[PDB]
Amino acid sequence: DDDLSARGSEERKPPVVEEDDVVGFDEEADIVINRLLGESNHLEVVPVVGMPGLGKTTLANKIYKHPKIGYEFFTRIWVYVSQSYRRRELFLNIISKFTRNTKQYHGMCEEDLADEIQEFLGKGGKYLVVLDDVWSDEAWERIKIAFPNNNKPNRVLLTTRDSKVAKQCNPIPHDLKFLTEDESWILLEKKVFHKDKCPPELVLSGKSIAKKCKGLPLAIVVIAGALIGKGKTPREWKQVDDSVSEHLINRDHPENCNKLVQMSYDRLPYDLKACFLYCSAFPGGFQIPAWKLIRLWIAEGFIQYKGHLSLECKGEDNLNDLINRNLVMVMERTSDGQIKTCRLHDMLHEFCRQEAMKEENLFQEIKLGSEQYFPGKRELSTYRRLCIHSSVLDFFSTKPSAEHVRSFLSFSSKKIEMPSADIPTIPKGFPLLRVLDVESINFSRFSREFYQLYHLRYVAFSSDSIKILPKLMGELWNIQTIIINTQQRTLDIQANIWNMERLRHLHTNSSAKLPVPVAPKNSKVTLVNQSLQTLSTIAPESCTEEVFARTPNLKKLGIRGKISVLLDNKSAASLKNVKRLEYLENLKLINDSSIQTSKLRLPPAYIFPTKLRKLTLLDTWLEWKDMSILGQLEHLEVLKMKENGFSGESWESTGGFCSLLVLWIERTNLVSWKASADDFPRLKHLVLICCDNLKEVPIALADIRSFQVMMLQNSTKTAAISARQIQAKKDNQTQQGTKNIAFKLSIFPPDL
Amino acid sequence: DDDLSARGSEERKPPVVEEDDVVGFDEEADIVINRLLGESNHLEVVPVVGMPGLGKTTLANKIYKHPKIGYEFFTRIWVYVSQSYRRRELFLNIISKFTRNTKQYHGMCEEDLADEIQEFLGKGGKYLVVLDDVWSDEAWERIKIAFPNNNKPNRVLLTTRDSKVAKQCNPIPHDLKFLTEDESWILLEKKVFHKDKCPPELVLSGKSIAKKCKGLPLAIVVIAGALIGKGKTPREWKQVDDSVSEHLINRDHPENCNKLVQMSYDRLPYDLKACFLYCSAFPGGFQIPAWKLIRLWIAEGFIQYKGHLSLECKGEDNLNDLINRNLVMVMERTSDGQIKTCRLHDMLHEFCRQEAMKEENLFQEIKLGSEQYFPGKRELSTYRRLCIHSSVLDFFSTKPSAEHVRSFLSFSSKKIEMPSADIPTIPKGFPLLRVLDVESINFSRFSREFYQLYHLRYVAFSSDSIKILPKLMGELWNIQTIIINTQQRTLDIQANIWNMERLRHLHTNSSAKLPVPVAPKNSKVTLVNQSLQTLSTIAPESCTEEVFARTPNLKKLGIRGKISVLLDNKSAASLKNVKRLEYLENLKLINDSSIQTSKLRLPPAYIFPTKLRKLTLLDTWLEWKDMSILGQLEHLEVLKMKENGFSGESWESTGGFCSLLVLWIERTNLVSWKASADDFPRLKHLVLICCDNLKEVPIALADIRSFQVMMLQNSTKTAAISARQIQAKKDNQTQQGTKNIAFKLSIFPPDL
Ligand SMILES: O=P(O)(O)O[C@H]1[C@@H](OP(=O)(O)O)[C@@H](OP(=O)(O)O)[C@@H](OP(=O)(O)O)[C@@H](OP(=O)(O)O)[C@@H]1OP(=O)(O)O
Ligand SMILES: O=P(O)(O)O[C@H]1[C@H](OP(=O)(O)O)[C@H](OP(=O)(O)O)[C@@H](OP(=O)(O)O)[C@@H](OP(=O)(O)O)[C@H]1OP(=O)(O)O
Ligand SMILES: Nc1ncnc2c1ncn2[C@@H]1O[C@H](COP(=O)(O)OP(=O)(O)O)[C@@H](O)[C@H]1O
Ligand SMILES: Nc1ncnc2c1ncn2[C@@H]1O[C@H](COP(=O)(O)OP(=O)(O)O)[C@@H](O)[C@H]1O
């Protein structure tokens, strides 16, 4: 008899980078910048202090990516220090950012670990460090031992939310400023309407809203998301106005922000409402892989197929919507421009964890204080999903048991070996499992009970010693996604992939030798699966036309092993088979052999599928003359070569890359590059890493409109000079009135 | 120019059980026993409360062994609950009391583990359980889940030092009373003069001393220890009295007791002073094995060659003196009467640990509060010895590094597996290690660096998968003691045991096949070691005249494998070879085979060594006639058969066991035994386990004067009736007044 919100559903559009500028934060950035290099030849910290959600990390990032900072300091490191940081991993990451080899530093202790960072940071010159979210003095005191004072100016900028810690760091703390009402309205309007200005009738309500928030940017962001969610009518704006007035009666108290979030969370469609709380199953501050979160959504059953739109495409669309609402923060992006990593804001993570734990009983995490004890069987029976990120081996020593647990997730930081006597603890404890993400857990083997988990839907695991997948592994029919990581070079699959009815993905690091696909003699059914979309690394010998036949809709492919077999005339038909797969859009060719036993030549262009959009090559040692073949591809859009992908000293672009957007060349011995503006009409991003041997970059690239961003790392001085000429040329073109997209140039070593 | 305490050193004599009776505590014992059957068909607790060292444990143990308690309750369990108790091990031990095989319980959870105990006590009926040293209320609440409230008259008796927990467990705690002045004097006299009476001259002094102890038995006993250390002269007693009055002005301060202990510690000779404090390296409340502790003293170098006594004998004498002074209390004793296990009292343990860690810097213990962090490299550099009993894997993940560490020992009840990545951590850290006890830690392998560490002197370790000892393991020249535990049935020694000159004792839990002794071709030196004292479990095939020739100082020999190979005279002469050992006290034979493929016959008497005093047979399945040969042996004093070592339905006593003092028979098929008093003149203790078939026990054995203690477990009711007839004859002896120690008969089931 009663119904509300009766309306149709419209389209939601892609999340292109926007509002890259920070509103009004530049003055604070400049005042902070002034205190940098205040006293040469000394190490000092610059505290930044304020309440959560105010914009401290936005300022820190704006400074860290400022031009003057990059020019002044050759070395710069960004490190995250959470509430629950760990020092050894932090030092490993710091050392890794500089070093190239991982083995040397692993056997060392944290003090000898700090000494290497000391020398590394000291040698170059001036260095600027950034510390995010430091909670206690002891954290800073323990961390700082790594930072050396090498008689030259070196600075560190740290952000914290408590006044006492900042007092201890420096006698005088820097205190951030709340936005003025005009700035509040400007930010709200820019976020809600993007380029377009606010309609006159909506202006009066928008001004009142901006004013209530009090100038805390996070509240303005959340309210803007809610406003775009609702739709634009004067009545709707009045309706949001009345509520925001109530919520913003007290502006400084914490819970108010939570209430605002609740508002934004209420309007969310019920499909996205579970996806949004699921993101908070991960640890606070964790960087979520986009593909792994979207796959964990389909297996949970949060995503429901509705017509033609694919489950994975739909899930990516959901993530784009969540980002657009400003609920999810986009940490990184791919070369394609698509999202790569994401995380939730601290306050939003708290809200989501509390809601999912208490109101909805979606999952529970087992976090133990020292006095506390691990729960017993009775309580665990009530749980539906588990999540253990802290000590889990101690949890499994208890020999837990729970029949009503369907999922288990463990996003540990380290990798933990499972004792041989505890391997059966997982299956026997949880025989009704649906998802099992234990990649941070290393399995020496699998007990027999792993093959009776008939309800398993997604599995990800890591095993150092695994070399053979038993036939029994193919018994389970429910699994839709599998991800495998193994240190062993060769993986032999004995489970029959083709009978498996559900799997929509397969992904491995090692090479995979598929069992030959044979139709049963007595069965009418044919083992063709429409659901499969990838085989990340199949062995070259397994690229037989039958195997390609079994996979109709693979939207991606990848081969690891010897590329010569497919390139060789005897087995050239093997590579020619790739023409069969129509859907292909992403092809990766990795080579592991370290001996250049012969030269390699690409077969003609028509062999490659028509849609191929992204291509990556590693250690193939191909001649730069073959680039014409890859140019003949009409759709190919991102091209990456790494670890000497193309070998040769002279390359002359011959055109063909009509629809290309990104070039990525890494660790090649090219010396002379020749090209014209018509070679790459549509290039946007250009990456050149460790090209220690190339004399010059074609100035013709300066004449191309799509060319937006350029990056050079560990390159020759002449290359940097040519890049600086290109920058000047594009600045002149933009100054000449042409509607040319803005040009940015970064040289990783600024002195090049 | 100044000297003091000039005197000669006199003998110290063995610590035989003495003052088994407790002074003036029978009142509380009968009060607690008066709570017996207070309200039938219900579960309740009896709290005992006081200050540390008052006598709560003594009173509880006196009640537990009381005849009335044993009669009323068939099932009785001792349980120790320290401050650092863990629930899971407690349940397993409780179940181990009832059932022989506990493998089914290992895969279970703690709640089902409690259910099994509850069913077991349901079978039992009336039951009294004792809990010692309960610190917190939550401890009692968590533990009590195991005890079934099945509407039976069952009791819990809990001892605690805190009033709050006692009152919460029961609103009427039993407040223990302080010993009176007369009882104080009598207790002091007993502890000092044992069965001898106090000389009149000292009497007054002792009385004063007793009155100054305030009725705290711990103070009285430690003071008696100090007095026995000083001597028995009036000046010594007066000095002790003055010092006691000096150090015990106050009452409620626990540190006063510590001061008293300090007074005893100062007089202890400098040699014993290292031991006394070393004993505290073990975890608080740990049940220290005697052989392990003594050999640790040997390896560390505290026990140095002085005189002619073997190092092991000197260590055993040291432990006996420590016990005599009442610093170390005796937990268990062997059948022959030697000490088996020991521990240190809580207050004395605290005193020793504080002194060792703070003043002498003998070692350091790493116990971490949750907020706390594991020490850094600088701090660890100043440590000479380490001991980790808490989480050690977390410590090793930090990759510690200290070059001045000479010992690393970790004692625990639960074994832990070492990750492969962590395996190299120990060797790199301690290239100068003098001793290593990682028996709780389990190694699948050892890193190559492990076999290089030449400083090691004692090694104890456990490995589940080890099957072969590599030749490199023989390189290490310093090791004096080795102890190995392996689950594998067969151990292959490839290190040249004879080349190694340092080793004094080798002990194993699995058959070891010795590399055949080879005399070096080019070396004048003979590979004969006088230091070696035993090979606990060698393979039968290893028994050879040459191997025995190598070792002339073996007091103990034990063999595990096929006994038939040696026993047959046609092939080889191994059991004839064992004759060539001048002095062999302990000989053990264990048969792996479960089939009587060949009947086994004992070689003649002249083959056995002259002095054999302890002999153990397991599954040998010899015939009762062969008893005569064992009877022909002259000096035999302890004899044990277990697991059907001697099988047959009829045994007629030949006689001649002139010197036998103890006879242990377990798992025998005998039904009838004929004996006369002259057959076993010197019997002291007789033990019968799980003899569900024997018809009767001989009446003549009751005529043996030396016969003191006899116990029957899981025996026939008719056997128990004959045993009660023997006990009635012993009561008749007591009525007569024969100068034979009073005889007590204990049966595991009272109803038998
Ligand atoms: O799948 P692609 O379109 O080919 O992108 C790949 C992929 O990352 P994403 O799937 O998240 O985009 C790689 O990871 P995997 O496919 O193996 O899982 C990743 O790293 P690896 O090639 O080492 O595996 C690589 O990034 P990078 O070039 O830094 O190595 C690159 O992602 P990007 O296009 O963002 O670089
Ligand atoms: O050495 P003890 O402390 O006296 O223990 C002895 C025996 O040793 P002995 O034959 O030298 O007396 C065994 O101890 P170890 O040989 O391993 O050192 C052990 O028997 P198992 O090792 O075969 O189990 C044990 O057995 P239990 O205590 O169960 O009777 C037995 O104890 P007793 O001292 O009472 O004879
Ligand atoms: N001046 C601003 N303009 C645009 N967005 C802002 C501004 N200040 C803050 N934000 C947004 O508010 C959110 C929370 O701010 P954040 O950077 O986390 O500050 P803090 O770390 O101090 O809470 C961020 O996602 C950021 O995008
Ligand atoms: N009547 C007695 N009361 C208490 N302790 C006694 C008595 N007689 C001897 N002792 C000594 O007390 C020691 C153990 O008891 P103690 O630790 O003092 O009490 P509790 O363990 O209950 O605190 C034994 O070594 C024993 O020698």
Residue numbers in the entry:
A (entry chain A), B (entry chain G): 134 to 885
Give verbatim lines from the article.
Unlike most NLRs, the plant NLR required for cell death 2 (NRC2) belongs to a small NLR group characterized by constitutively high expression without self-activation. In this study, we discovered that SlNRC2 forms dimers and tetramers and higher-order oligomers at elevated concentrations. Using cryo-electron microscopy (cryo-EM), we performed structural analyses and found that SlNRC2 adopts an inactive conformation in both the dimeric and oligomeric states. Structural comparison shows that SlNRC2 dimerization and oligomerization act to stabilize the inactive conformation.
In contrast to the tetrameric and filamentous SlNRC2, the coiled-coil domains in the dimeric SlNRC2 were not well defined and hence were not included in the final refined model. The C2 symmetry-related SlNRC2 molecules in the dimer form a ‘head-to-head’ interaction through two interfaces. The first interface is facilitated by the packing of the N-terminal outer surface of the LRR domain from one protomer (SlNRC2A) against one end of the three-helix bundle of the NBD domain from the other protomer (SlNRC2B). This interface involves tight contacts of the C-terminal end of the α-helix from the second LRR of SlNRC2A with a short loop region which links α9 and α10 in SlNRC2B. Additionally, SlNRC2A Tyr506 from the loop region N-terminal to α22 interacts with SlNRC2B Glu271 and Arg275. The N-terminal end of the LRR domain of SlNRC2A symmetrically stacks with its equivalent from the SlNRC2B molecule, forming the second interface which mediates SlNRC2 dimerization. In the structure of the dimeric SlNRC2, the N-terminal end of the SlNRC2A LRR domain is wedged between the NBD and LRR domains of SlNRC2B, hence stabilizing the relative conformation of these two structural domains. A structural comparison between the inactive SlNRC2 dimer and a lateral dimer from the ZAR1 resistosome showed that the SlNRC2 dimerization interfaces overlap with the lateral dimeric ZAR1 surface mediating resistosome assembly. As IP6 was most prominently detected, this IP molecule was modelled in the extra cryo-EM density in the dimeric SlNRC2. On the other hand, these two LRR residues, along with the three residues from the WHD, directly interact with IP6/5 from the top. These interactions result in a total of 13 salt bridges and 4 hydrogen bonds between IP6 and SlNRC2.
